[PDB]
Amino acid sequence: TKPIVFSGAQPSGELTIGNYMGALRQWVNMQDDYHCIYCIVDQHAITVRQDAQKLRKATLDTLALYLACGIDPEKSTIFVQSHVPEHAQLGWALNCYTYFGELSRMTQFKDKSARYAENINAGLFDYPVLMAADILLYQTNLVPVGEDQKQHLELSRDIAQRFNALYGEIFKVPEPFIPKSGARVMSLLEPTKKMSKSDDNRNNVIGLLEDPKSVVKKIKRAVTDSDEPPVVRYDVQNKAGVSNLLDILSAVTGQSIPELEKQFEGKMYGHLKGEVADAVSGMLTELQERYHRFRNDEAFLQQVMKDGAEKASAHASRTLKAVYEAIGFVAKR
Amino acid sequence: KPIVFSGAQPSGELTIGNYMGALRQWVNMQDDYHCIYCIVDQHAITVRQDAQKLRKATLDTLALYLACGIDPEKSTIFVQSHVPEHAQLGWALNCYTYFGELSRMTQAENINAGLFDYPVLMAADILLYQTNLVPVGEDQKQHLELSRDIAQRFNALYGEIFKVPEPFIPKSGARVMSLLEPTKKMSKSDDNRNNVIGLLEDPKSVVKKIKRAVTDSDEPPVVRYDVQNKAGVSNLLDILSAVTGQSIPELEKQFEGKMYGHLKGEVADAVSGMLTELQERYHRFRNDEAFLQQVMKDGAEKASAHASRTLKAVYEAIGFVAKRHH
Ligand SMILES: Nc1ncnc2c1ncn2[C@@H]1O[C@H](COP(=O)(O)OC(=O)[C@@H](N)Cc2c[nH]c3ccccc23)[C@@H](O)[C@H]1O
Ligand SMILES: CC(=O)c1ccc(C#N)s1
């Protein structure tokens, strides 16, 4: 049997070119090489308060976007987290092998808490434990994520090792799969802050379903630097904006940073932004054309969710049975 | 009938205080209320413990509740982990529970997240079954208040999804104090086990513990009820009264001119007489694997039918895409 890939994305906010280059691009590329399982994590999404109509619509938007990206339900398992009870069941059990201190020091908990001061809820605190359960249920070997989820992924490894040390080889210890390009795509007007799928300022983001014409204008207004003469060179510390533009271009076109720096010799930020805008506009035009074909086909989305939850349940029920046997529960008849 | 929810820990060995107080009270109210008894194995694992002992203790607890007279045809009795909806609702309710509410619980770096987060699972345990009444000890009144706050908060956003549970106010009326500390209530959790009589203790064990039970230095010895001045003798009278149904004044009359050895002898005989039918039922039920399997299966099926209806309404209110059944 092939090694197992697992990853997820939240049906909340609006997925960006950051979410694509950090995660979804790798998801699509891994589908023949590994046994891939991809999840729409609606139980994680509600750690930030959602409107009920927007959450239901966003779950189906996210599913159609996975399909539009090239996630193939004949090759990959695609399912909605809340459809598989084992996630919450294993999440509770793993709370008992996770320390309070490990959770309080999490960067996501701190950042989301500062943003949503009026809804610092237990779900937002307990986020990493349910995420560990999501991964460990599927005997997962690789977890393709962006740089921002590295800390959560490291806790899931700590939990797996801690549980295995007491009970035996119940879980696989998962490894991160973080890409070389586009692991941390930055905000267009604040290039020291990562691109957010829920930014109050839309001018910071390249949304995967945004009007390409709107995206081209935002790229042209992306902040660069005061360098005289202007030079197209990758340097995060001194040239955050220009570096972010080169990272995006590299990720879309497949061209290396040395290749792009050579291409832009004797050229300035007009040429760079022109090439970023053209590459991104083309990618989003084609992606969006595939998206609407899937998104408006409710019979197809309904079948993908049904088949996916069925495949996921078979794997998850096997792992949870072993966890429950190990910790000493009377087995359900 | 109103729905009543009780969580039964699979660890504590029950005492005559547990039985003659709350359990006997509730055994005789199974036709008055829809009583639910949930053996809370998912709560137990917040304290690291031997796995085989936890499996054993789950079955020990099921058999003893059945032996005490919980009727699986009248009441719903099941193992918590057999009903996924508990964990499912508990995660959902985490997202409507303030971090501050769990921080402010009366009860930090090396506490496990289970010991921090279990009040939310307790809220889910109650709210799943549209529970009207919860019998709580003083120790879990804060937990019931959080469950009520979560229910009202969720209902305020989404409509009347949950019943707001109430504490079951009226108490048993049977008083059972610690044998070597009669000011302290006889507690299953008591570290000193010479203070307690467990429901599975043999007649020789009961004689030994009752003979050590503290009394007083009154001369002549006098069997009279007086909690302030004669806490020990008063406790022995309350235990004998709870077993036999004889009034305190009748027992004071019965032990006129009698010494504390006579009282102790009759307390031990009365208690062991009560524990005979209980222990006979226990050892019969505990060693009938097919009977315990059938009770757990039927109980989980009844619980799941109710729990699934509540969870479906919660999931619909939150806006989750409904699962596609195969
Ligand atoms: N600016 C950015 N640049 C590059 N990558 C980025 C950027 N912003 C976000 N990402 C990545 O996008 C993925 C989805 O993010 P979500 O917030 O939906 O979703 C999250 O952040 C996960 N906790 C959801 C999850 C739940 N359970 C799991 C189990 C395995 C893997 C992932 C999960 C993520 O991989 C994230 O790293
Ligand atoms: C019952 C409850 O509170 C939970 C279920 C899954 C969790 C995680 N992680 S917490």
Q: Which among A49, A96, A104, A300 is the top mutation candidate for probing chain B, defined by the most B β-carbons within 10 Å of its own β-carbon? A: A96
Q: Which among A83, A87, A95, A113 is the top mutation candidate for probing chain B, defined by the most B β-carbons within 10 Å of its own β-carbon? A: A95
Binding-site entries of A for ATP = 10-12, 18-19, 146-148, 185, 194-198
Q: What is the DSSP string of A125-148?
A: HHHHHHHHHHHHTTT-SEEE--GG
Pairing of strands A4-9, A35-40: parallel
The shortest C-alpha distance from B113 to chain A (Å) reads: 5
Handedness of CA A187, A190, A191, A196 (dihedral sign): negative
Please state, in angstroms and rounded to a whole number, the distance separating the CA atoms of residues B311 and B129: 10
Distances in Å between the Cα of A234 and the Cα atoms of A42, A247, B116, B139 are: 37, 8, 46, 61
Ligand with an atom nearest the CA of residue A177: 1
Determine the distance separating the centroid of ligand 2 and the alpha carbon of A148, expressed in angstroms: 23
CA angle A260, A262, A265 (to 5 degrees): 110
B71: which residues sit within 8 A by CB, 6+ positions away?
B30
Q: Is the separation of the CB atoms in B13 and B198 below 8 Å?
A: yes
Please state, in angstroms and rounded to a whole number, the distance separating the CA atoms of residues B2 and A187: 56
A97: which residues sit within 8 A by CB, 6+ positions away?
A159, A162, A163, B112
CA angle A188, A190, A196 (to 5 degrees): 70
Minimal CA–CA distance to A145: which of A158, A162, A128, A161?
A128
Reply yes or no on whether A75 is catalytic. Answer: no
The tokens 């997240």 sit on which residue?
A: B113
Reply yes or no on whether A267 is catalytic. Answer: no
H-helix or E-strand spanning residue B133: strand B133-134
Minimal CA–CA distance to B29: which of B10, B7, B1?
B1
- DSSP helix/strand/coil, B229: coil
What is the phi/psi pair of residue B189, to 5°?
A: -80, -10
Determine the distance separating the centroid of ligand 1 and the alpha carbon of A144, expressed in angstroms: 9
The tokens 């524990």 sit on which residue?
A: B275
Q: Within 13 A of B144's CA, how many CA atoms are on the CB side?
A: 20
Backbone dihedral region of B80: left (phi > 0), alpha (psi from -120 to 50 degrees) or beta?
alpha
Q: Cβ(A145) to ligand 1 under 6 A?
A: yes
| Cβ neighbours of B95 in A, within 8 Å | 46-47, 49, 121-124
Minimal CA–CA distance to B134: which of B67, B142, B66, A92?
B142
Handedness of CA B222, B225, B229, B234 (dihedral sign): positive
Crossing angle of helices A150-167 and A107-115, in 10° steps, is: 130
Please state, in angstroms and rounded to a whole number, the distance separating the CA atoms of residues A145 and B103: 31
Tokens of A316: 């998850």
Distances in Å between the Cα of B316 and the Cα atoms of A212, B93, B310, B311, B320 are: 35, 14, 10, 8, 6
Reply yes or no on whether A197 is catalytic. Answer: yes
Please state, in angstroms and rounded to a whole number, the distance separating the CA atoms of residues A108 and A152: 9
Q: CB count, 10 Å around CB of B37?
A: 22
The tokens 């479906």 sit on which residue?
A: B312
Please state, in angstroms and rounded to a whole number, the distance separating the CA atoms of residues A235 and B294: 68
User: In this structure, which residue's CA is closest to atom 1 in ligand 2?
Assistant: B90
DSSP category for residue B246: -
Q: How far is CA A282 from the centre of its chain?
A: 22
Q: Cβ(B94) to ligand 2 under 6 A?
A: yes
Determine the distance separating the centroid of ligand 1 and the alpha carbon of A22, expressed in angstroms: 8
**Method by which this entry was solved:** X-ray
Q: Cβ(B117) to ligand 2 under 6 A?
A: yes
Read off the amino acid at residue B170: P
Please state, in angstroms and rounded to a whole number, the distance separating the CA atoms of residues B289 and B55: 13
Rounded CA Rg of chain B = 22
Q: Is the separation of the CB atoms in A157 and A140 below 8 Å?
A: no
Q: Which residues pair with A207 in a beta bridge?
A: A16
Read off the amino acid at residue B39: I
Minimal CA–CA distance to B15: which of B215, B240, B275, B287?
B275
Q: CB count, 10 Å around CB of A202?
A: 12
- DSSP helix/strand/coil, A268: coil
Sheet with B3-8: list strands edge to edge. Answer: B76-79, B34-39, B3-8, B133-134, B166-167
Q: What is the resolution of this structure in A?
A: 1.8
- DSSP helix/strand/coil, A156: helix
The total number of residues shown for chain A amounts to 333
Q: What is the DSSP string of B157-182?
A: HHSS-S---EE---------B-SS-T
Distances in Å between the Cα of B308 and the Cα atoms of A9, A40, A333 are: 26, 22, 18
Tokens of B4: 């009543």
Please state, in angstroms and rounded to a whole number, the distance separating the CA atoms of residues A61 and A50: 15
